[PDB]
C-alpha cells in the first residue's frame, strides 16, 4: 500500500489495493430433511426427548407460517438488487415440477448439479442427518409414546442432530425468509468448500474465496423456498467475483480551514471513499461500508457503484485543476474531527478543542497545532480530540506527502460566503 497526504486539500489517497468485485451469483439449493416428527408424541410428562421433540415440531410448524407470509409478500442498493435476483430464482424452484426434479436428482446422492426450467444452473445438496435419526432410531425407540427412556444417548443424539434445523428456522423467522448472510447452519464449511469448488470460475477465484470464506458468507445470503412435507428447501446465493485484480484506491478527507480573528473559511473534499477500475470505467463507492478490505484486496459490489470520469483522479494531484470540477463543500463553520486512513489519520483541530497524539507506552507524545495535521501510524498509536480517543491501525506501507499551501489559506474568512455544499472549487472563491 502507498498513502499520500495531500496538504493542499487536507486529504489522503491510499493506492495499491486490488479489486474483488461481485458481478453475479451461484445458486446452491438445499433440502433439509426433518422426517415424520409430527406423527410422534410424548404422553409421559416432562422429559429430555419430549423437550427436543416439541422444539422440533414447533420449529417446523413456525417455518410453514414464515413461508406462507413470505410467499404472499413475494407474489442498501446492493441488498435490494441481490434480493430481487434471488427471489426470481426462488419462484422458479417453487414450481412443483422443479421441487420433485430436485428431490429426485437427490435421491441417489447427497449432491447433484441441475439446470432449472428457468435456465439457471444450480447445485443441489441433501442434508439427511435429522430425518435418518428420526426414522432409523427415534420413531422406534418411542414405542408407545414413551419418551422418558433411560438411554440418555438417544436424547443427546436428538439434541445433536436437530440443532442445525432449529438454527435455520430461527434465521428465516427472524429475517422473514431472507437471511442477511450465510451462517454455518445454512451452509457448513465443508459444504461451502464443495460449492466453491463446483463453481465455473478460475483456480485463482477458488483460492481467494476459500481463503476468504468469512467474506464470502457476508457477501452471500439465503432464501427460503418453502416446506414441502418434512423437507425444508432453501437456496444460498454465493458471490461470483467476475472483476478481480484491478487497481483500487481510497480517498479520505477532513475539513481544511483558515482563520482570521474568530472568522473561519473552510474547505472539505466531498469525493471521499473507494474507487475501483472496472473495464474502462472508474467505479466510485461513497459509503465505505460498501467495500471491505482483507490485505491488499478490496471486496465491493458492482451493483452499488457510481461511474465517474477518469479525470476525477486529478483532484488527488491538484484540486484546483481546470480539467475536472473537483467537488468540495465550503463554509464558515469549522468542524474538528479525525478521519482515519489506512496508514494514518487526518486530524482537523479548530476553535476550542484540544488535540494530541499519544503512544500506548509513553502517553502524550505532543499537542497538535491548529488546522490540519497528518499523523502516520508509525509516529503514534492514538489521536485524541477532547475526550475522544481514536486508535490508529498497524498496517505497514509507504507514506508520501504532496506538499503545498492549503487552498483554504487563499480564502478570506472575513466576509466568506455562506455554506456551499457539493460545489466546484471555483464557486467557493466567489
Amino acid at each position, epitope marked *: 500500500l502507498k498513502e499520500s497526504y495531500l496538504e493542499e486539500s487536507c486529504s489522503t489517497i491510499t493506492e495499491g489495493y*486490488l479489486s474483488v468485485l461481485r*458481478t*453475479g451469483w451461484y445458486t446452491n439449493v438445499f433440502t433439509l430433511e426433518v422426517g415424520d416428527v409430527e406423527n410422534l408424541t410424548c404422553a409421559d410428562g416432562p422429559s429430555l426427548i419430549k423437550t427436543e421433540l416439541d422444539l422440533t415440531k414447533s420449529a417446523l410448524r413456525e417455518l410453514r407460517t414464515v413461508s406462507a407470509d413470505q410467499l404472499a409478500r413475494e407474489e442498501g442498493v446492493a441488498t435490494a438488487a441481490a434480493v430481487t435476483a434471488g427471489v426470481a430464482i426462488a419462484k422458479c424452484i417453487r414450481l412443483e415440477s422443479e421441487v420433485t426434479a430436485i428431490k429426485n436428482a437427490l435421491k441417489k446422492t447427497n449432491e447433484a*448439479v441441475s*439446470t432449472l426450467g428457468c435456465g*439457471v*444452473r444450480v447445485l443441489a445438496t441433501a442434508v439427511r442427518e435429522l430425518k435418518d435419526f428420526v426414522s432409523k432410531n427415534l420413531t422406534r425407540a418411542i414405542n408407545k409414546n414413551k419418551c422418558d427412556i433411560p438411554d440418555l444417548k438417544m436424547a443427546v443424539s436428538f439434541s445433536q442432530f436437530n440443532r442445525r434445523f432449529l438454527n435455520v428456522v430461527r434465521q428465516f423467522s427472524d429475517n422473514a425468509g431472507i437471511t442477511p448472510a450465510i451462517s454455518l447452519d445454512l451452509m457448513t464449511d465443508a459444504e461451502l468448500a464443495r460449492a466453491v469448488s463446483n*463453481m*465455473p*470460475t*478460475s483456480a*485463482g*477465484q477458488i483460492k481467494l474465496m476459500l481463503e476468504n470464506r468469512a467474506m464470502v458468507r457476508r457477501k452471500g445470503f439465503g432464501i427460503l423456498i418453502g416446506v414441502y412435507g418434512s423437507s425444508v428447501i432453501y437456496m444460498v446465493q454465493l458471490p*461470483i*467475483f*467476475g*472483476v*478481480i*485484480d*484491478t*487497481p483500487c484506491w481510497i480517498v479520505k478527507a477532513a475539513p481544511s480551514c483558515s482563520e482570521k480573528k474568530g472568522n473561519y473559511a473552510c474547505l472539505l473534499r466531498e469525493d471521499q471513499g473507494w474507487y475501483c*477500475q*472496472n*473495464a*474502462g470505467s472508474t467505479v466510485y463507492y461513497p459509503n465505505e461500508k460498501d467495500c471491505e478490505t482483507r490485505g491488499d484486496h478490496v471486496f465491493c459490489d458492482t451493483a452499488a457503484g457510481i461511474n465517474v470520469a*477518469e479525470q476525477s483522479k486529478e483532484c488527488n494531484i491538484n484540486i484546483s485543476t481546470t480539467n475536472y470540477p473537483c467537488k468540495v463543500s465550503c463554509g464558515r463553520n469549522p468542524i474538528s474531527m479525525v478521519a482515519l486512513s489506512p496508514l494514518g489519520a487526518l486530524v482537523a483541530c479548530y476553535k476550542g478543542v484540544s488535540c494530541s497524539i499519544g503512544s500506548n507506552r509513553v502517553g502524550i507524545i505532543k499537542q497538535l497545532n491548529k488546522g490540519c495535521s497528518y499523523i502516520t501510524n508509525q509516529d503514534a498509536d492514538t489521536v485524541t480530540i477532547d475526550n475522544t480517543v481514536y486508535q490508529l491501525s498497524k498496517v505497514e506501507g509507504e507514506q508520501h506527502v504532496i506538499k503545498g499551501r492549503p487552498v483554504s489559506s487563499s480564502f478570506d474568512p472575513v466576509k466568506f460566503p455562506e455554506d456551499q455544499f457539493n460545489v466546484a472549487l471555483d464557486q467557493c472563491f466567489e
Partner: antibody
Amino acid sequence: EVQLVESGGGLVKPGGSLRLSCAASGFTFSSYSMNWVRQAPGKGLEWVSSISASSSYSDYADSAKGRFTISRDNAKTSLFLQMNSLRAEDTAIYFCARARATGYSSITPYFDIWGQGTLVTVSS
Amino acid sequence: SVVTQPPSVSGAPGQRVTISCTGSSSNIGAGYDVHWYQQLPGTAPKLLIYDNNNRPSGVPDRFSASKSGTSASLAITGLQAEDEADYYCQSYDRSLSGVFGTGTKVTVLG
C-alpha cells in the same frame, strides 16, 4: 482508438528464444486481463497464456508451461511473451487479445479486441 | 477434452445454416458459457457472439447462437456472401482453461 499492435516476430531455430511485445493504446490497459492466442498456418485458434490486470494471476496452456512466460508493464501499456526452447510446432501467427468476463452466470472470458498478430517461424 | 466443430458447412445465399460446438463435462457441461468468433482469411478473429447469445454492436441480427448442456450452436439465418469465413466457438475448461473449438469453414454457394 482501441488498438493492439504485436511486435518481435521472426525466424528462430529449434531450441531458440524470442520475446513478443504488444503495444496497447486507446484504452485503460491496467483494467483488463490480457491474453496470447496463436494460429498455426492453415490451422485453428489456440489459447496460449493469460495474465490478470495487475499480474497477480497468470495461466498457460500445457504446451507453453515451463517454456513460455507472460508478463505486462502497465506503465508502458505493453504485454510480453517470453518464449524459450521453441520447437517447429510453435510456428504460428501470435495474436495479442484483450479479455472481458461478464461474471453473471460464470467467469468465462471472451476476447473483444485482437491485434493483427506477428508471425513466429521456428525452423532449422 | 477438445471442443469439436464440423470442418465445413455450406449453404445457398439466403439459406439458414447451423454450426455445432460439441463440448464436454469439463467445459460447457461444467457451467461455462460459449463465445463465437468470425475470421476472414488474412485477418484477426472478430468477436461475433459473447455469453452464449449476445451480439456485439457491429454484428447483424442474422447471427444467433445458443447453448444446451454440453454443446452449443451458431445459426446464420440468411447467408450472405460476406459470411463466408472461418467460425470458432470458445469456452473455458476446468483443467485446460481457455479452449477454442476446432473451427468451421462456411461456404456460401453463390
